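User: Modeling request: complex.
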Amino acid sequence: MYDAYISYVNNENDRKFVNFILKPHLENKYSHKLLLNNTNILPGAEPSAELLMNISRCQRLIVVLSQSYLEQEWCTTNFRQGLWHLIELSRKPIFIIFQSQQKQISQDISQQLRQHQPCITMITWGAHSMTPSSGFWKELALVMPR
Amino acid sequence: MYDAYISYVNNENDRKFVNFILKPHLENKYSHKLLLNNTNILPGAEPSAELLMNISRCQRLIVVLSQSYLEQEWCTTNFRQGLWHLIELSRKPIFIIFQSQQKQISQDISQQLRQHQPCITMITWGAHSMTPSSGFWKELALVMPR
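Assistant: Request completed. Predicted assembly structure:
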């Protein structure tokens, strides 16, 4: 049924980005019906129940992979296992990272994300974005359904 | 229409493996209809003609990634780009490698294949295999259609 599933953590910056920037744009021009939650989709580095039951009715998975998101226990203790689970559960999860925060992204996380690069989409957000013609919205459009 | 696409090079070992072991087994119990060619699917490290037109009517891609296969030009000159094209063209290409030949496989290629590990399937062939219940045939069954 749904076009995408949006996994984020509920840090102020992140929730304004999800609810004011991203959710309105994908719901308008691209006509999408979105599912989204700010809980831990990988408790114990194993898929949660809400995610196991909900993802099967979503075509894509967008992770708002911020510094606050990357502080979660699965991110800090077994990012490979969780990334495996994401890739295996949706096929081509999209990961939104932030140019301002890439300072903070630890070595192993950036390497794991580039390593799988054809499989996963890495989208980056800078000052350039928000103009609907943008590297960001171009990329996110090409990886969305139809 | 087709279950799998089998890319091999036509070195003695390879064509006998494709035609006597693999094609008969996958076409029997697993009821598969197989497409296969021994030409270069990545000329100039870009998809060939038959591969682009045929792959759209195939659900899986198996590469018989032997020592002889890896001597081809795209393998030796731009294996990352060709692997990118494969991942982008089929969704989870399967790569059959040989335990006897993993000896000969250079560093960069083995590591590129492990890098993408959730996305691509790596199946390895040893003395154990050919018993239809096999680490090999179990794995190859779990990555095949339905």
